[PDB]
Amino acid sequence: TRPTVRPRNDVAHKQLSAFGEYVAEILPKYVQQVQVSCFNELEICIHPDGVIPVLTFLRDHSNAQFKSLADLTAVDIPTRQNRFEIVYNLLSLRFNSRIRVKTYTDELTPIESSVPVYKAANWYEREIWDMFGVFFANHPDLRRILTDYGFEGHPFRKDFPLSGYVELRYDDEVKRVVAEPVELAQEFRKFDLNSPWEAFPAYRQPPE
Amino acid sequence: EYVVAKLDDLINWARRSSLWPMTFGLACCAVEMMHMAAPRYDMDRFGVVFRASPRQSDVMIVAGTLTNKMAPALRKVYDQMPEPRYVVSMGSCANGGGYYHYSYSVVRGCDRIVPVDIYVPGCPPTAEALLYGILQLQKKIKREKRLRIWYR
Amino acid sequence: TSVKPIFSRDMNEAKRRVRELYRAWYREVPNTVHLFQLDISVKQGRDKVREMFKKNAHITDPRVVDLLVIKGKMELEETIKVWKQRTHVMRFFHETEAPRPKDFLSKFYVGHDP
Amino acid sequence: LTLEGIKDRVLYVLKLYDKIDPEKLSVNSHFMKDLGLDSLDQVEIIMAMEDEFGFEIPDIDAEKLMCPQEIVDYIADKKD
Amino acid sequence: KKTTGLVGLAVCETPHERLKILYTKILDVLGHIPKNAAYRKYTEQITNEKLSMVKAEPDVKKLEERLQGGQIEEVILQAENELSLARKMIQWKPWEPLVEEPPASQWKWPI
Amino acid sequence: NLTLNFGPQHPAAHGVLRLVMELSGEMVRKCDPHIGLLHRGTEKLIEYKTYLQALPYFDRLDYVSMMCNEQAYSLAVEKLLNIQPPPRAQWIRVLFGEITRLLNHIMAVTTHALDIGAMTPFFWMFEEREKMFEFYERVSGARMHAAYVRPGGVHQDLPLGLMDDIYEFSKNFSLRIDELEEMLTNNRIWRNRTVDIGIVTAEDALNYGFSGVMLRGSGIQWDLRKTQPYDVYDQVEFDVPIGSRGDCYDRYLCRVEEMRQSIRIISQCLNKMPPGEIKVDDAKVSPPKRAEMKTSMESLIHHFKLYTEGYQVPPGATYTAIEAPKGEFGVYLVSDGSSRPYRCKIKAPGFAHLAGLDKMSKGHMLADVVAIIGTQDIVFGEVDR
Amino acid sequence: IPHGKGGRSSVSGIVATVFGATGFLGRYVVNHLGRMGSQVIVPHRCEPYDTMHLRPMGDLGQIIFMDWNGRDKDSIRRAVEHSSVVINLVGREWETQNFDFEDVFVKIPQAIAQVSKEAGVEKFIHISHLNADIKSSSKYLRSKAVGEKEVRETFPEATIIKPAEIFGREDRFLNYFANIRWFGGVPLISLGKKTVKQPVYIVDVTKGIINAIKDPDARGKTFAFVGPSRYLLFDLVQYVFAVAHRIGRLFEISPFEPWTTRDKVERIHTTDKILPHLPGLEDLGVEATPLELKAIEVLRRHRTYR
Ligand SMILES: NC(=O)c1ccc[n+]([C@@H]2O[C@H](COP(=O)([O-])OP(=O)(O)OC[C@H]3O[C@@H](n4cnc5c(N)ncnc54)[C@H](OP(=O)(O)O)[C@@H]3O)[C@@H](O)[C@H]2O)c1
Ligand code: SF4
């Protein structure tokens, strides 16, 4: 249209529309939704029964190398009736292509972990346990990383408030550094920022 | 007495002439102190030597941001110091914990644990106001040891 | 429930597991009290152990108790070794905290109904 | 080797505990159907044989004894 | 050459027939799978595409072209794992249809 | 076996990273370190801020990078907003984006050479480093931590100067890198201090998910610097170093040649900059100028509202990564559709680069282990991802 | 008036003033007063550095430091002009080389029985001792009971507190024992007749003040501090060497902070289990502490494990 607008391309939008299509064709057992992003990204929605073999299928091939496990993350979504959302991100070395794996779950239902499939998930997989409580299956060493020793909260979900309950202080009553209920000097004034009038036409909801 | 009070103009001068500091590198306020060690604003030989073992310290410096996993380890090193000690904390995250201040796991203040004497403000204090804080500290030593047991 | 469990199946692989590590705590309470160099009586520690197990006895559903098993076992990893430097073990006892009133006439003179 | 030898050792375990049992050192204190305890406190009864006379308690038999006869009986086949 | 570029492997040893066994090693195991999934339809397609250009021509350097892997010893590893891939295709069953459809509104993004 | 925790010791380096050592007499064979000394509550904290207001908390994520961080954020936001940045602005993001690599690759050698215990190459190079912070103060706002890159391109134009200064600076730097060549390369003892240490070269050197150096310098040729573009970054000419074997001394010799590339690129970038503007013109993202927000009516309503709330970002997930001077830099920025973003999960190096210390360490001494760590160039506060 | 929880950063209404407060007793009392939160006004005598370890108890703005001598008047008046209550605990052992040491328990409690009382304070509380009697023993033990009556003329209702001997961490009486590494460990004086007094525990001391500080109605009705169960024995001296297994002084050393072979040695061996008709501790409840549990803490010698 003009300068100062991102020039999109169609070549990568073509092959990523082409490549991911016959992925669901050759495993119609686990794949439940595939979508192409408008900027050359791919999602393969997978029910977590096939958490191991689909990775194991992308672990090796002759048309898809994909042996660079970059990113394990975790996203919570309340009001979904199955809250959490484990999302991978893996890289083909020989092909320069990004693709993500979106696998939902719930809290108490475990997930067969990727421990034999990848050995870069040694510290990433434990993190979701410490922050959410998503108990992955058959991990050789589940422990506590990046949190303090006495928490019971799994803080990165939404019901855990901004401060905890555990504002710490010292006294010379004997020697100890003792815990106490939390007390702030200031509210953290919470604003109200959502302007009305719906700046977006394309993502318009079903109007019910 | 003119005879006895003349003596503490040597001893309370001698302690403000040789300070052997510890530094706790934790966050981005550690890096700027290294440039004070770099010989532009050469920190050595203006009264004060470089790094030193944890035993032989007088002036401890907390720099950066404290977490609850470090609140026990701070007090234990603070016990092992000898008696005429002083605590001086640089960095705006050692005075109220900067921002990160409303977070669930950051020590609010670095004052509810140790008693600190001189507060330098700022995300990084630019190794320009920090020598000014140290000359403030030697200016703070105008105290006396005589006319304390000579009074009471 | 269309969901697979963690370890137990129904209440009988469960309730034998909560009894199981109780002995591991029970020989641990005299073991650590001379180790972490703190000074209370050792029977207070055995009272606080059974304090924790008995309070959560209002569960009639598996894999939640089993979820507490993983929580209960992970406590012993720092405990048998030395990963709680003389504070976290003292954190179990609300010692220097002022007492909550918990009485209606006592609440009424102090507080806007907390 | 005396089968009376493990009879004395078992029958001052229970009253050495200062809890529930009011000098009922009888062989028929049938443990929460006669004697009356907590579900956890049964496991603490089994505990004092590792140090007194020495004993392992390897298996689910601690969930099986339920009477101080069978405690002697499970040490009976253990010993003689 | 004595170093294979990519450090961690060794030129071990002979091209043109170490490969030629391992393609044909897969094709015999490939026939074992029941043919309803298109996994056979593409995997047997590319191996016959590969082995036709593999067998049997000089040199090692010419075989690098028209066979888009790394060096030729690493092209072993391109199909080494693929032999370990296809034998586990008998163990689980991807040719079976879909299982556990999500409850009808989950993959909608704006809450 | 003795279970010493040589870590919390404030023995120079960086008094942190407290770990265990189940050493088998003299060899280690088991190392299980602990992290979490600074967790800081970062990823939870951003969930209440807006886009422009949350921006310096990316800056304080390293200790060193000031323009390579926030390079991984605006480029992670401008894709969502359908904007290419204006062409004068792209020549500055490559200039300061190829000047922070002349801060890591000075600090990544000297601080490694201080744990080892050499004194004089620590003072011989930071005294030359002072000639470079005068740039940061002259252009943006402060000593180090500069909220300078915005989502609307560059904040403001660099003033008169800074072109006969950088050319003055960069024409006298290769003599200083020829100093440390005499200090460490031709020396034998430091070579004897690091040869065949940390030989990790197999496909588990990539199955551990490592980013660059402690990659390609050990073998596998790949980088994000000429297979994936950023800005005007492919229109310059350079090469990428590869070492011979898979040890630390053949990932050390990447960094000498790496600094010999950033001098070429700066001396190539200065010849090609056109005059132009700074910000994006459509002003739903960039603020208007100060001489404009005092005259017209249209300027204030697209000024006063643009600071109460932020932008209007469309929904849909996104992801990117760029070359941090020690690795990749993953940002999986979940957008919701308002002025305040949703989840913002970051991947920093050190998750891979220090979990693989278990493989790398064993079979070796205890004095080896401190010499291992200063080769990966691990900075804490950055392992807070 | 109070507000919210008194965990920290509250108001709680009260505004106290604690003199002395540099020794073992006066420090540990205030460490409760900055927990519930109030305007604690502590003036110190001549010591800027010796209050450094005190500050991290009051949160922020709650404590304040001033200078005063005591023989001056307005320095004891300018500070106390805005408060509600005031306690005092000032005093020490042996006579100074410059002071007078008699009127310090007479005119110095009178110096704050000055316009201080007239200014509008209430619930003024002084300290006593259980053994301070008008009898001819001792030079320090008596002349404390002189202040108990001659200054009792002023402040007609006070509830002056009367403690027994105290044991805590860094006192003098219990640390007089086991600091006797010597060529002979002799008791006082090779006899098990009168030993011992009533060692009340230090948490009970600081708990008695905070209950009485808004009790109400505790003025004039003076109180006594019960000790442990029950009198005590000679076994205490043997109890030391059994389980132990046998601050602004100067720049080098103080020339005279001695063991004082004078009337120091008799001020403790004069037990005087006094009148039980004082209410005085259990009614100001609740204080119940044994000795056998708190003895591990304060004693510290070379074994440290077994
Ligand atoms: N309850 C008991 O068992 C017991 C036992 C022995 C003594 N006492 C007496 O009860 C109180 C307990 O004191 P403590 O155990 O904490 O030891 P302490 O060191 O005597 O504390 C009392 C404070 O009074 C200060 N002081 C002494 N003379 C002073 C003067 N002329 N002017 C101003 N301040 C003076 C002292 O030093 P500064 O001048 O530096 O402030 C000290 O800080 C004292 O009065 C003590 O004589 C009680
Ligand atoms: S905010 Fe200040 S104290 Fe915190 S990391 Fe940055 S410079 Fe250091």
PDB file of N, CA and C in Angstrom, chain A residues 55 68-75 86-91 98-101 120-121 124-125 127-128, chain F residues 43 208-209 318-321 328-333 343-348 351-352 385:
ATOM      1  N   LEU A  55       6.488 -35.864  18.473  1.00  0.00           N
ATOM      2  CA  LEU A  55       7.857 -35.396  18.665  1.00  0.00           C
ATOM      3  C   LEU A  55       8.861 -36.413  18.163  1.00  0.00           C
ATOM      4  N   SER A  68      16.415 -29.217  17.065  1.00  0.00           N
ATOM      5  CA  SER A  68      16.821 -28.099  17.908  1.00  0.00           C
ATOM      6  C   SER A  68      15.648 -27.672  18.777  1.00  0.00           C
ATOM      7  N   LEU A  69      15.549 -28.259  19.968  1.00  0.00           N
ATOM      8  CA  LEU A  69      14.516 -27.898  20.931  1.00  0.00           C
ATOM      9  C   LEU A  69      14.901 -26.567  21.552  1.00  0.00           C
ATOM     10  N   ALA A  70      14.185 -25.509  21.175  1.00  0.00           N
ATOM     11  CA  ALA A  70      14.500 -24.191  21.701  1.00  0.00           C
ATOM     12  C   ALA A  70      13.690 -23.890  22.953  1.00  0.00           C
ATOM     13  N   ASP A  71      12.368 -23.899  22.841  1.00  0.00           N
ATOM     14  CA  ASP A  71      11.528 -23.243  23.833  1.00  0.00           C
ATOM     15  C   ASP A  71      10.449 -24.192  24.328  1.00  0.00           C
ATOM     16  N   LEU A  72      10.509 -24.524  25.615  1.00  0.00           N
ATOM     17  CA  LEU A  72       9.362 -25.011  26.365  1.00  0.00           C
ATOM     18  C   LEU A  72       8.828 -23.885  27.230  1.00  0.00           C
ATOM     19  N   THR A  73       7.555 -23.551  27.056  1.00  0.00           N
ATOM     20  CA  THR A  73       6.916 -22.542  27.885  1.00  0.00           C
ATOM     21  C   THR A  73       5.670 -23.139  28.514  1.00  0.00           C
ATOM     22  N   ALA A  74       4.931 -22.293  29.224  1.00  0.00           N
ATOM     23  CA  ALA A  74       3.666 -22.682  29.820  1.00  0.00           C
ATOM     24  C   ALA A  74       2.785 -21.452  29.918  1.00  0.00           C
ATOM     25  N   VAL A  75       1.571 -21.563  29.400  1.00  0.00           N
ATOM     26  CA  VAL A  75       0.604 -20.477  29.417  1.00  0.00           C
ATOM     27  C   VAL A  75      -0.667 -20.968  30.085  1.00  0.00           C
ATOM     28  N   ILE A  86       0.450 -26.184  27.549  1.00  0.00           N
ATOM     29  CA  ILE A  86       1.862 -26.436  27.306  1.00  0.00           C
ATOM     30  C   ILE A  86       2.112 -26.203  25.829  1.00  0.00           C
ATOM     31  N   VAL A  87       3.113 -25.389  25.508  1.00  0.00           N
ATOM     32  CA  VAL A  87       3.424 -25.046  24.127  1.00  0.00           C
ATOM     33  C   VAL A  87       4.918 -25.219  23.908  1.00  0.00           C
ATOM     34  N   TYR A  88       5.285 -26.039  22.936  1.00  0.00           N
ATOM     35  CA  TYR A  88       6.676 -26.228  22.568  1.00  0.00           C
ATOM     36  C   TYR A  88       7.068 -25.235  21.489  1.00  0.00           C
ATOM     37  N   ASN A  89       8.351 -25.253  21.141  1.00  0.00           N
ATOM     38  CA  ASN A  89       8.821 -24.596  19.934  1.00  0.00           C
ATOM     39  C   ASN A  89      10.133 -25.239  19.520  1.00  0.00           C
ATOM     40  N   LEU A  90      10.166 -25.777  18.302  1.00  0.00           N
ATOM     41  CA  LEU A  90      11.309 -26.546  17.837  1.00  0.00           C
ATOM     42  C   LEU A  90      11.770 -25.996  16.498  1.00  0.00           C
ATOM     43  N   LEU A  91      13.016 -26.303  16.152  1.00  0.00           N
ATOM     44  CA  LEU A  91      13.673 -25.708  14.995  1.00  0.00           C
ATOM     45  C   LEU A  91      14.267 -26.789  14.110  1.00  0.00           C
ATOM     46  N   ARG A  98      10.353 -22.621  11.511  1.00  0.00           N
ATOM     47  CA  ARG A  98       9.842 -22.624  12.869  1.00  0.00           C
ATOM     48  C   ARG A  98       8.464 -23.261  12.878  1.00  0.00           C
ATOM     49  N   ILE A  99       8.216 -24.078  13.891  1.00  0.00           N
ATOM     50  CA  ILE A  99       6.904 -24.675  14.088  1.00  0.00           C
ATOM     51  C   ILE A  99       6.723 -24.915  15.578  1.00  0.00           C
ATOM     52  N   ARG A 100       5.500 -24.724  16.048  1.00  0.00           N
ATOM     53  CA  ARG A 100       5.174 -24.875  17.453  1.00  0.00           C
ATOM     54  C   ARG A 100       4.198 -26.019  17.631  1.00  0.00           C
ATOM     55  N   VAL A 101       4.171 -26.557  18.839  1.00  0.00           N
ATOM     56  CA  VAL A 101       3.313 -27.667  19.192  1.00  0.00           C
ATOM     57  C   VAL A 101       2.471 -27.205  20.366  1.00  0.00           C
ATOM     58  N   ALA A 120      17.250 -31.664  26.317  1.00  0.00           N
ATOM     59  CA  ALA A 120      17.285 -30.251  26.669  1.00  0.00           C
ATOM     60  C   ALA A 120      16.131 -29.878  27.582  1.00  0.00           C
ATOM     61  N   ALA A 121      15.202 -30.805  27.806  1.00  0.00           N
ATOM     62  CA  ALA A 121      14.060 -30.578  28.678  1.00  0.00           C
ATOM     63  C   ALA A 121      14.347 -30.975  30.113  1.00  0.00           C
ATOM     64  N   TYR A 124      13.813 -27.385  31.865  1.00  0.00           N
ATOM     65  CA  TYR A 124      12.565 -26.758  31.455  1.00  0.00           C
ATOM     66  C   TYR A 124      11.338 -27.456  32.006  1.00  0.00           C
ATOM     67  N   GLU A 125      11.293 -28.780  31.959  1.00  0.00           N
ATOM     68  CA  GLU A 125      10.143 -29.535  32.426  1.00  0.00           C
ATOM     69  C   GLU A 125       9.897 -29.416  33.913  1.00  0.00           C
ATOM     70  N   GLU A 127      10.349 -26.784  35.653  1.00  0.00           N
ATOM     71  CA  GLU A 127       9.904 -25.425  35.927  1.00  0.00           C
ATOM     72  C   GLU A 127       8.387 -25.337  35.968  1.00  0.00           C
ATOM     73  N   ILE A 128       7.711 -26.104  35.114  1.00  0.00           N
ATOM     74  CA  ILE A 128       6.254 -26.078  35.080  1.00  0.00           C
ATOM     75  C   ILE A 128       5.681 -26.734  36.328  1.00  0.00           C
TER      76      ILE A 128
ATOM     77  N   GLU F  43       8.460 -12.325  35.116  1.00  0.00           N
ATOM     78  CA  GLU F  43       7.419 -12.670  34.159  1.00  0.00           C
ATOM     79  C   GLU F  43       6.020 -12.480  34.710  1.00  0.00           C
ATOM     80  N   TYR F 208      21.168 -30.907  23.481  1.00  0.00           N
ATOM     81  CA  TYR F 208      21.027 -30.040  24.644  1.00  0.00           C
ATOM     82  C   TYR F 208      20.517 -28.650  24.290  1.00  0.00           C
ATOM     83  N   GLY F 209      20.373 -28.330  23.009  1.00  0.00           N
ATOM     84  CA  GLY F 209      19.734 -27.093  22.621  1.00  0.00           C
ATOM     85  C   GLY F 209      20.605 -25.876  22.789  1.00  0.00           C
ATOM     86  N   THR F 318       2.786 -14.877  18.735  1.00  0.00           N
ATOM     87  CA  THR F 318       3.962 -14.635  17.916  1.00  0.00           C
ATOM     88  C   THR F 318       5.190 -15.118  18.660  1.00  0.00           C
ATOM     89  N   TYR F 319       6.293 -15.176  17.925  1.00  0.00           N
ATOM     90  CA  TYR F 319       7.563 -15.613  18.468  1.00  0.00           C
ATOM     91  C   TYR F 319       8.661 -15.137  17.543  1.00  0.00           C
ATOM     92  N   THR F 320       9.786 -14.760  18.133  1.00  0.00           N
ATOM     93  CA  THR F 320      11.005 -14.575  17.372  1.00  0.00           C
ATOM     94  C   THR F 320      12.198 -14.726  18.292  1.00  0.00           C
ATOM     95  N   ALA F 321      13.380 -14.648  17.692  1.00  0.00           N
ATOM     96  CA  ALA F 321      14.631 -14.652  18.432  1.00  0.00           C
ATOM     97  C   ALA F 321      15.675 -13.967  17.575  1.00  0.00           C
ATOM     98  N   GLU F 328      20.951 -17.268  21.321  1.00  0.00           N
ATOM     99  CA  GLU F 328      19.628 -16.916  20.832  1.00  0.00           C
ATOM    100  C   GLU F 328      18.928 -16.098  21.900  1.00  0.00           C
ATOM    101  N   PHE F 329      17.761 -15.556  21.568  1.00  0.00           N
ATOM    102  CA  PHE F 329      17.018 -14.829  22.589  1.00  0.00           C
ATOM    103  C   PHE F 329      15.529 -14.996  22.294  1.00  0.00           C
ATOM    104  N   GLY F 330      14.928 -16.036  22.852  1.00  0.00           N
ATOM    105  CA  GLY F 330      13.543 -16.365  22.581  1.00  0.00           C
ATOM    106  C   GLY F 330      12.605 -15.469  23.363  1.00  0.00           C
ATOM    107  N   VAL F 331      11.623 -14.904  22.667  1.00  0.00           N
ATOM    108  CA  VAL F 331      10.512 -14.189  23.284  1.00  0.00           C
ATOM    109  C   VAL F 331       9.226 -14.703  22.666  1.00  0.00           C
ATOM    110  N   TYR F 332       8.379 -15.313  23.480  1.00  0.00           N
ATOM    111  CA  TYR F 332       7.089 -15.823  23.030  1.00  0.00           C
ATOM    112  C   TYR F 332       6.041 -14.885  23.600  1.00  0.00           C
ATOM    113  N   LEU F 333       5.814 -13.787  22.905  1.00  0.00           N
ATOM    114  CA  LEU F 333       5.014 -12.678  23.405  1.00  0.00           C
ATOM    115  C   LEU F 333       3.551 -12.933  23.072  1.00  0.00           C
ATOM    116  N   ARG F 343       0.682 -12.921  28.830  1.00  0.00           N
ATOM    117  CA  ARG F 343       1.941 -13.615  29.110  1.00  0.00           C
ATOM    118  C   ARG F 343       3.083 -13.240  28.181  1.00  0.00           C
ATOM    119  N   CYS F 344       4.261 -13.097  28.779  1.00  0.00           N
ATOM    120  CA  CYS F 344       5.485 -12.716  28.082  1.00  0.00           C
ATOM    121  C   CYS F 344       6.586 -13.637  28.600  1.00  0.00           C
ATOM    122  N   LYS F 345       6.685 -14.828  28.019  1.00  0.00           N
ATOM    123  CA  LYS F 345       7.708 -15.783  28.415  1.00  0.00           C
ATOM    124  C   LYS F 345       8.958 -15.551  27.591  1.00  0.00           C
ATOM    125  N   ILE F 346      10.089 -15.505  28.265  1.00  0.00           N
ATOM    126  CA  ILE F 346      11.369 -15.282  27.621  1.00  0.00           C
ATOM    127  C   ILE F 346      12.208 -16.546  27.723  1.00  0.00           C
ATOM    128  N   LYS F 347      12.977 -16.821  26.682  1.00  0.00           N
ATOM    129  CA  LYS F 347      14.050 -17.799  26.733  1.00  0.00           C
ATOM    130  C   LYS F 347      15.367 -17.059  26.635  1.00  0.00           C
ATOM    131  N   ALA F 348      16.208 -17.223  27.635  1.00  0.00           N
ATOM    132  CA  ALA F 348      17.548 -16.673  27.586  1.00  0.00           C
ATOM    133  C   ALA F 348      18.519 -17.835  27.490  1.00  0.00           C
ATOM    134  N   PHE F 351      19.975 -21.528  30.268  1.00  0.00           N
ATOM    135  CA  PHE F 351      19.161 -22.714  30.500  1.00  0.00           C
ATOM    136  C   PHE F 351      19.773 -23.929  29.828  1.00  0.00           C
ATOM    137  N   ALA F 352      20.070 -23.821  28.542  1.00  0.00           N
ATOM    138  CA  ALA F 352      20.812 -24.885  27.896  1.00  0.00           C
ATOM    139  C   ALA F 352      22.279 -24.828  28.289  1.00  0.00           C
ATOM    140  N   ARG F 385      14.960 -16.291  33.233  1.00  0.00           N
ATOM    141  CA  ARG F 385      13.950 -16.532  32.220  1.00  0.00           C
ATOM    142  C   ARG F 385      13.025 -17.677  32.619  1.00  0.00           C
TER     143      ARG F 385
END
